[PDB]
Design an enzyme around this catalytic site. Structure first.
Site, PDB file in Angstrom:
ATOM      1  N   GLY A  16       0.727  -1.217   0.053  1.00  0.00           N
ATOM      2  CA  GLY A  16       0.163   0.018  -0.201  1.00  0.00           C
ATOM      3  C   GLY A  16       0.961   1.183  -0.097  1.00  0.00           C
ATOM      4  O   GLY A  16       2.028   1.309   0.436  1.00  0.00           O
ATOM      5  N   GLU A  45      12.982  -9.168  24.503  1.00  0.00           N
ATOM      6  CA  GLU A  45      13.299 -10.585  24.471  1.00  0.00           C
ATOM      7  C   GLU A  45      13.137 -11.039  22.938  1.00  0.00           C
ATOM      8  O   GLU A  45      13.820 -12.360  22.771  1.00  0.00           O
ATOM      9  CB  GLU A  45      12.181 -11.482  25.502  1.00  0.00           C
ATOM     10  CG  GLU A  45      12.875 -12.564  25.825  1.00  0.00           C
ATOM     11  CD  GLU A  45      12.233 -13.115  27.189  1.00  0.00           C
ATOM     12  OE1 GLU A  45      12.200 -12.334  28.246  1.00  0.00           O
ATOM     13  OE2 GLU A  45      12.053 -14.359  27.126  1.00  0.00           O
TER      14      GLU A  45
HETATM   15  N1  LIG Z   1      -3.727  -9.861   4.375  1.00  0.00           N
HETATM   16  C1  LIG Z   1      -4.448  -8.826   4.111  1.00  0.00           C
HETATM   17  N2  LIG Z   1      -3.940  -8.012   3.062  1.00  0.00           N
HETATM   18  C2  LIG Z   1      -4.279  -7.030   2.625  1.00  0.00           C
HETATM   19  C3  LIG Z   1      -5.555  -6.361   3.550  1.00  0.00           C
HETATM   20  N3  LIG Z   1      -5.889  -5.132   3.133  1.00  0.00           N
HETATM   21  C4  LIG Z   1      -4.993  -5.043   2.024  1.00  0.00           C
HETATM   22  N4  LIG Z   1      -4.088  -6.054   1.815  1.00  0.00           N
HETATM   23  C5  LIG Z   1      -2.961  -5.973   0.885  1.00  0.00           C
HETATM   24  O1  LIG Z   1      -2.169  -4.748   0.894  1.00  0.00           O
HETATM   25  C6  LIG Z   1      -1.578  -4.439  -0.275  1.00  0.00           C
HETATM   26  C7  LIG Z   1      -2.090  -2.855  -0.619  1.00  0.00           C
HETATM   27  O2  LIG Z   1      -1.946  -2.267   0.808  1.00  0.00           O
HETATM   28  P1  LIG Z   1      -3.109  -1.308   1.449  1.00  0.00           P
HETATM   29  O3  LIG Z   1      -3.323  -1.780   2.975  1.00  0.00           O
HETATM   30  O4  LIG Z   1      -4.503  -1.917   0.769  1.00  0.00           O
HETATM   31  O5  LIG Z   1      -2.651   0.048   1.168  1.00  0.00           O
HETATM   32  P2  LIG Z   1      -2.975   1.285   1.902  1.00  0.00           P
HETATM   33  O6  LIG Z   1      -2.192   1.568   3.437  1.00  0.00           O
HETATM   34  O7  LIG Z   1      -4.615   1.352   2.377  1.00  0.00           O
HETATM   35  O8  LIG Z   1      -2.446   2.269   1.000  1.00  0.00           O
HETATM   36  P3  LIG Z   1      -3.280   3.586   0.241  1.00  0.00           P
HETATM   37  O9  LIG Z   1      -4.769   3.014  -0.042  1.00  0.00           O
HETATM   38  O10 LIG Z   1      -2.379   3.227  -1.164  1.00  0.00           O
HETATM   39  O11 LIG Z   1      -3.144   4.740   0.560  1.00  0.00           O
HETATM   40  C8  LIG Z   1      -2.309  -5.486  -1.247  1.00  0.00           C
HETATM   41  O12 LIG Z   1      -1.279  -6.430  -1.439  1.00  0.00           O
HETATM   42  C9  LIG Z   1      -3.343  -6.284  -0.481  1.00  0.00           C
HETATM   43  O13 LIG Z   1      -3.482  -7.265  -0.907  1.00  0.00           O
HETATM   44  C10 LIG Z   1      -6.102  -7.251   4.766  1.00  0.00           C
HETATM   45  O14 LIG Z   1      -7.135  -6.827   5.084  1.00  0.00           O
HETATM   46  N5  LIG Z   1      -5.459  -8.394   4.643  1.00  0.00           N
END
Ligand SMILES: Nc1nc2c(ncn2[C@@H]2O[C@H](COP(=O)(O)OP(=O)(O)OP(=O)(O)O)[C@@H](O)[C@H]2O)c(=O)[nH]1
Ligand SMILES: Nc1ncnc2c1ncn2[C@@H]1O[C@H](COP(=O)(O)OP(=O)(O)CP(=O)(O)O)[C@@H](O)[C@H]1O
Ligand SMILES: COc1cc(C(=O)c2c[nH]c(-c3c[nH]c4ccccc34)n2)cc2c1OC=CO2
Ligand SMILES: Nc1nc2c(ncn2[C@@H]2O[C@H](COP(=O)(O)OP(=O)(O)O)[C@@H](O)[C@H]2O)c(=O)[nH]1
Ligand SMILES: [Ca+2]
Ligand SMILES: [Mg+2]
Ligand SMILES: [Mg+2]
Lengths: 332, 427, 437, 54
Positions: C143, C254
């Site tokens: 993200g 730890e």
């Molecule tokens: N395991 C898991 N992966 C997630 C989840 N939500 C998003 N992802 C993963 O996160 C990545 C993208 O990151 P995000 O968390 O969506 O990005 P963000 O921090 O919201 O950043 P922006 O939306 O670009 O401002 C992708 O690879 C998704 O697969 C979640 O709830 N669980």
């Protein structure tokens, strides 16, 4: 259609394996670094095993077993046999071996044992009779070298008083089945062996390549199994099966069953097969000795067709099906 | 994340009008502006394209623009004409005369500021403004000349918002005037600099689809606009409806556009349908996947097999197995990996929407950044030089103050565009 | 007792934080309104769970947590969710515009405008702490916020809280659940910028969780909720020693002591078993030996890699349920014979074991079945660097053409930070090789 | 296989088993880089507005 990529252009074997696969019409060859392949015919060094098995919707296979180098590198081979309980120091088919790096672990203590009865003390790396002759030859290169007992009394074919080695080709599939190619090859010395002059090492080294007499008794210094079986019958009143091939099937079985837990791809996200070449030497008592395991082997010209086709059916199409056997399964 | 809509000229208003007809029906908003819909999915992201008026009525965030009153009166007469906000009709009386110079430098210059005022009043109401989408053609005068003049001014005032266009390219198979290659070449020069994403809706492709695939012997603009509205609904689904991706115009640019000038997409639709007549066999997810990647389903007359895909976006609409959609989309890439660049990993993205468009139980919309779009620009470029090497019809432009050298610069900039698309076809 | 502050950044971090705090509440007997009937010390205390929860005068137990996302959709569901009473409004921080999958936009453009506010809401929690241990930071690699803003925050925390530990729970990008084509860029950028500011990092590769859901939970297409409830199970296993009475891993320090002998190689591999489906009507409960053995099966790891072709530097077994040390040692004995478990020559070949008798907790209506016993193994093996190689290769393919780089330069970043970030990665891959050969 | 440092409590126990023995930037620096980027942004935007002005 299945897809594959080639990353070793010097593979005589898998050069064929590409041609036979394209000719099926059901295999298409991508470019080297296209990650969306089903099959990788990969490089010899630094093959990127860490990258296989992560393409969603793609069942990936590869023609090398990660970690098999332990068996296919002389230095590692000796370390493996010494330190595995499956093989053990009391191993009756591997000549005495010691690893000596260039800059004597327990090698001296063994060579001094032979001064107790003046037993044969010929070794190899290269061939010498004094330890000082050999030891001063490994520091002249700079890399790791291993020295092994030279089989002073080997088995010689008459006519010729000649030396040879047996190379068997073994295929291990994704299920860790061990397939022994029924056709083997004896690489023969056209030079009459004689223990007086080691340094004339042309009747002592049996390499097809080193024999730059080429073609006297048999073509390309290569005798096949039908010919060698008939000789053994006519000469020694035995067969290739009983006097030799049992021991070979035993060694092949033992070496690969040893390292199975380390290289098995049974529960992995990518899969491995690999063709090996085992190189044996037969002494005068009809005892078979393991010399080297070759992870990148080259086939004899007469057999490329048959073996490479067996590689497709057994290792490749077993995982990517399409629309008696040339191998002997060594059971475990 | 509101979007501001702008339709300019005869073509822009006509396809623009159908877009609001189509999506209003998908969101269950009738001509009165009231919501009479079954699902709450229809109202969750309704603010992207609609302003909420007192009495809980919905007003499109649309600005209707033209240098002539004819087509805009047609829009107001039309079925959903009353849905638009009356103050957002901004029109002149002289007309552009299929003349880019008139739209850009003279007749449009008088009307541009009034349009910007209506744009500004809609922007100030926006909670968080994504950007703008313009519907127009590049072969006329108003949509082409004034539209690009509007785009340049909007970028000056909103330099940090997304500029999206639905640009109709001209074709001799459907042409009003010989000067369309001039109007198009001048406009593309502008789009290359001032738009983040432009969908190349090629009138040549719309014709061939109507003639060949739909077996329409003589296709009207209404038959072409039926294809255009289907495409416009499809390439807007991720914006208008909730999804896993949480899609918006800026993220679309980030993922689709590896190099800023290469932002011209090949739209595609499946299944292809002629107006009125409805066929009764829904397709199989495998059928959607192959038709959508088929050259016959592309809305720009380019051969995808004459190029490579930089990035692709596919949106499936209907009740279907997302597992099957995954497999099928994965199958086509692995089957034809030679037509996707290898140096952009995972360059194909698939989204799904539960609500299908009116008339179909399942459909698929395809958005492709293919290097094969250079074929489109080559075609327009060849038509341009054929007249330009003789300076034919230039007097219509020089009479409005333009110079020969401006044509040469626009010709050259587009040729560079073709060189750049070729660069990555061999990379 | 020493308090631990959790910071959840981005969608992945926030939604994963929801899963964890929901699980912590069920484990400790805290109901959605913040009341804990079992707690007899009203209004305060210094119990082990007080590491993660503070108490109000009214008896409510409030997470020592801050949620920060540059966009309101996700944290807004926390504001209206089942545990809305649990968090004070100042604990949830939002913006209006996300980072558009752009590390540079999250780090430089939008991040610079919200960093001071977040640090102040973090300071409000730190002011309730008699002895703050450090931070647990949940985020994604892929993200724009999860990568760009996190590294921004990690740098500041090192400045303001220089003597406190920082642990990471990072989601490593997988195409089955990918949200952006530039995720390799964001991963390398944020890893490079955060590397020196993180004491220990647990990578969860979405590919691994996804497949575990399909294979072991019989889910055709797992959702974020499917992945997240499984992930919180692993996180809970890792953090249980902080919130429960025990001798092993009782402070964030730890974790660095037991799992990280060298600072840069601070990415321990987590393996968890058993993952059993609620839908299965007849299940056979697995023994201590069967679940311990499963820890050396790559199919149960949070990252897919082959530990047989690497070397270990530490190894912990965190058991939950009906487990006693005799059975553990017996299982370790038989496993040591049958498995390829090689340690670096300068570390002892040994396991550090922790056992909590309360068996694992499951969310009602979840996909995970209730088990008699379970284990989470945390091993620091060089084989995890396979993940860096996969990520760095994809980075190399795109950066060779500088594809999408203009989006980053356009936010004020310089092309040089890409190559600098990738040089650090190249160095990281080499450090792993020296240890592993 | 030596078991060591076995600690017990009502919640569980913990121990160690040994099979075999062996063989930050300032705040102002962060402020500099943060502000350098914003300037590179303002410079590129000014260039854009100058080009539009032409
Ligand atoms: N395991 C898991 N992966 C997630 C989840 N939500 C998003 N992802 C993963 O996160 C990545 C993208 O990151 P995000 O968390 O969506 O990005 P963000 O921090 O919201 O950043 P922006 O939306 O670009 O401002 C992708 O690879 C998704 O697969 C979640 O709830 N669980
Ligand atoms: N202990 C031993 N005693 C006597 N002769 C031996 C021997 N070990 C090997 N030889 C013979 O001398 C040669 C030793 O060299 P070596 O086995 O390393 O060649 P090589 O096996 O690397 C060629 P390739 O890899 O293609 O099979 C062998 O070919 C064998 O004929
Ligand atoms: C798919 O279709 C859409 C996605 C988005 C979007 O926001 C969005 C967010 N990540 C991506 C994405 C990630 N990897 C990709 C690889 C190729 C293409 C896109 C992506 N794309 C927005 C859209 C849209 O289609 C119509 C209008 O807007
Ligand atoms: N597809 C489509 N193309 C159109 C339509 N109307 C006009 N065009 C095309 O647009 C060009 C003429 O532009 P037009 O919009 O009428 O000129 P303007 O009003 O001055 O902007 C020609 O290439 C026409 O083929 C329409 O309704 N649909
Ligand atoms: Ca208390
Ligand atoms: Mg017209
Ligand atoms: Mg977000």
């Amino acid at each position: 259609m299945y897809t594959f990529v080639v990353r070793d252009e010097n593979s005589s074997v898998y050069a064929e394996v590409s041609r036979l696969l394209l000719a099926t019409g059901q295999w298409k060859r991508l470019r080297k670094d296209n990650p969306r392949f089903n099959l990788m015919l990969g490089e010899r060094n630094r093959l990127p095993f860490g990258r296989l098995g992560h393409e969603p919707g793609l069942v990936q296979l590869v023609n090398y077993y990660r970690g098999a180098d332990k068996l296919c590198r002389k230095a590692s081979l000796v370390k493996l046999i010494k330190t595995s309980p499956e093989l053990s120091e009391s191993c009756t088919w591997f000549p005495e071996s010691y690893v000596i790096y260039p800059t004597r672990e327990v090698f001296l203590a063994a060579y001094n044992r032979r001064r107790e009865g003046r037993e044969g003390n010929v070794w190899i790396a290269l061939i010498s009779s004094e330890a000082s002759e050999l030891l001063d030859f490994i520091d002249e290169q700079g890399q790791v070298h291993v020295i092994q007992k030279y089989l002073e009394k080997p088995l010689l074919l008459e006519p010729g008083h000649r030396k040879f080695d047996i190379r068997s080709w073994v295929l291990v599939d994704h299920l860790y089945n061990i397939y022994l190619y029924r056709e083997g090859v004896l690489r023969t010395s056209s030079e009459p062996y004689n223990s007086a002059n080691f340094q004339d090492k042309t009747c002592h080294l049996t390499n097809h390549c080193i024999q730059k007499n080429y073609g006297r008794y048999e073509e390309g210094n290569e005798m096949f199994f039908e010919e060698f079986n008939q000789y053994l019958m006519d000469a020694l009143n035995t067969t290739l099966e009983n006097s030799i091939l049992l021991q070979i099937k035993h060694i092949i079985r033992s070496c690969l069953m040893c390292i199975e837990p380390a290289i098995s791809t049974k529960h992995l996200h990518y899969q491995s097969f690999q063709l090996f070449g085992f190189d044996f030497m037969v002494d005068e008592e009809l005892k078979v000795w393991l010399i080297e395991v070759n992870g990148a082997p080259a086939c004899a010209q007469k057999l490329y067709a048959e073996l490479c086709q067996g590689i497709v059916d057994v290792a490749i199409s077993s995982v990517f099906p399409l629309a008696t056997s040339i191998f002997i399964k060594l059971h475990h | 994340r509101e979007i501001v809509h702008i339709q300019a000229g005869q073509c822009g208003n006509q396809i623009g009008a159908k877009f609001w007809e189509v999506i209003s029906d998908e969101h269950g908003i009738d001509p009165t502006g009231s919501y009479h819909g079954d699902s709450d999915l229809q109202l969750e992201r309704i603010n992207v394209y609609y302003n909420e008026a007192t009495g809980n009525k919905y007003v499109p965030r649309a600005i209707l623009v033209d240098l002539e009153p004819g087509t805009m009166d047609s829009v107001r007469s039309g079925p959903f004409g009353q849905i638009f906000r009356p103050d957002n009709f901004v029109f002149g009386q002289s007309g552009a005369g299929n003349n880019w110079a008139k739209g850009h430098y003279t007749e449009g210059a008088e009307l541009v500021d009034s349009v910007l005022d209506v744009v500004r009043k809609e922007s100030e109401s926006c909670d968080c403004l994504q950007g703008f989408q313009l519907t127009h053609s590049l072969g006329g005068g108003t949509g082409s000349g004034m539209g690009t003049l509007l785009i340049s001014k909007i970028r000056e005032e909103y330099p940090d918002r997304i500029m999206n266009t639905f640009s109709v390219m001209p074709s001799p198979k459907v042409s009003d005037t010989v000067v369309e290659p001039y109007n198009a070449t001048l406009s593309v020069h502008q789009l290359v600099e001032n738009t983040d994403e432009t969908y190349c809706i090629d009138n040549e492709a719309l014709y061939d689809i109507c003639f060949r695939t739909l077996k329409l012997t003589t296709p009207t603009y209404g038959d072409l606009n039926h294809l255009v509205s289907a495409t416009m609904s499809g390439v807007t689904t991720c914006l208008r409806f909730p999804g896993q991706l949480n899609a918006d115009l800026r993220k679309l640019a980030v993922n689709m556009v590896p190099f800023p000038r290469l932002h011209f997409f090949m739209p595609g639709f499946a299944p292809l349908t002629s107006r009125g007549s409805q066929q009764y066999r829904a397709l199989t997810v495998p059928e959607l996947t192959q038709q959508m990647f088929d050259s016959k389903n592309m809305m720009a007359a380019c051969d995808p097999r004459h190029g490579r895909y930089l990035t692709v976006a596919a949106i499936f609409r209907g009740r279907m197995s997302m597992k099957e959609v995954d497999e099928q989309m994965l199958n086509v890439q692995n089957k034809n990996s030679s037509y996707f660049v290898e140096w952009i990993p995972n360059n194909v993205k698939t989204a799904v929407c539960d609500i299908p468009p009116r008339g179909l139980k399942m459909s698929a919309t395809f958005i492709g950044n293919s290097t094969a779009i250079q074929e489109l620009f080559k075609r327009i470029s060849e038509q341009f030089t054929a007249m330009f090497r003789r300076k034919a019809f230039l007097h219509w432009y020089t009479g409005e103050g333009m110079d020969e050298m401006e044509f040469t610069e626009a010709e050259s900039n587009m040729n560079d565009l073709v060189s750049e698309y070729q660069q990555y076809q061999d990379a | 007792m020493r308090e631990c502050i959790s910071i959840h950044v981005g969608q992945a971090g926030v939604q994963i934080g929801n899963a964890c705090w929901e699980l912590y509440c069920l484990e400790h007997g805290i109901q959605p309104d913040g009341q804990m009937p079992s707690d007899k010390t009203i209004g305060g205390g210094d119990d082990s769970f007080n590491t993660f929860f503070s108490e109000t005068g009214a008896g409510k137990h409030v997470p020592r947590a801050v949620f920060v996302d540059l966009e309101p959709t996700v944290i807004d569901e926390v504001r209206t969710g089942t545990y809305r009473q649990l968090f004070h409004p100042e604990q949830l921080i939002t913006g209006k515009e996300d980072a558009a999958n752009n590390y540079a936009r999250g780090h430089y453009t939008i991040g610079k405008e919200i960093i001071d506010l977040v640090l102040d809401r973090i300071r409000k929690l730190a002011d309730q702490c008699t002895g703050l241990q450090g931070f647990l930071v949940f985020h994604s690699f892929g993200g724009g916020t999860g990568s760009g803003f996190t590294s921004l925050l990690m740098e500041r925390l090192s400045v303001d809280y220089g003597k406190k530990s920082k642990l990471e729970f990072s989601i490593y990008p997988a195409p089955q659940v990918s949200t952006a084509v530039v995720e390799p860029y964001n991963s390398i950028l944020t890893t490079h910028t955060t590397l020196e500011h993180s004491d220990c990092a647990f990578m969860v590769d979405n590919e691994a969780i996804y497949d575990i859901c399909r294979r072991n939970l019989d889910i055709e297409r797992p959702t974020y909720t499917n992945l997240n409830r499984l992930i919180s199970q692993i996180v809970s296993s890792i953090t249980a020693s902080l919130r429960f009475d025990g001798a092993l891993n009782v402070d964030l320090t730890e974790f660095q002591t037991n799992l990280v002998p060298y600072p840069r190689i601070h990415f321990p591999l987590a393996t968890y078993a058993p993952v059993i489906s609620a839908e299965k009507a007849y299940h056979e409960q697995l023994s201590v030996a069967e679940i311990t053995n499963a820890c050396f099966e790559p199919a149960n790891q949070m990252v897919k890699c082959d530990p047989r072709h690497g070397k270990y530097m530490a190894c912990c077994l965190l058991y939950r349920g009906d487990v006693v040390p005799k059975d553990v040692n017996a299982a370790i004995a038989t496993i040591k014979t049958k498995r390829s478990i090689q340690f670096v020559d300068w570390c002892p070949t040994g396991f550090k074991v922790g056992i909590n008798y309360q068996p694992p907790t499951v969310v009602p209506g979840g996909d995970l079945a209730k088990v008699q016993r379970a284990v989470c193994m945390l091993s620091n093996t060089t084989a995890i660097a396979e993940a860096w190689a996969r990520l760095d290769h994809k980075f190399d393919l795109m950066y060779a053409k500088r594809a999408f780089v203009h989006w980053y330069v356009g936010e004020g970043m310089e092309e040089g930070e890409f190559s600098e970030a990738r040089e650090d990665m190249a160095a990281l891959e080499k450090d792993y090789e020296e240890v592993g050969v | 296989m030596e078991v060591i440092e076995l600690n017990k409590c009502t919640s569980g126990q913990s121990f160690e088993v040994i099979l075999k023995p062996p063989s930050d930037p300032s705040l102002e620096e962060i402020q500099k880089k943060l502000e350098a980027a914003e300037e590179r942004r303002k410079y590129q935007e000014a260039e854009l507005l100058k080009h539009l002005a032409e």
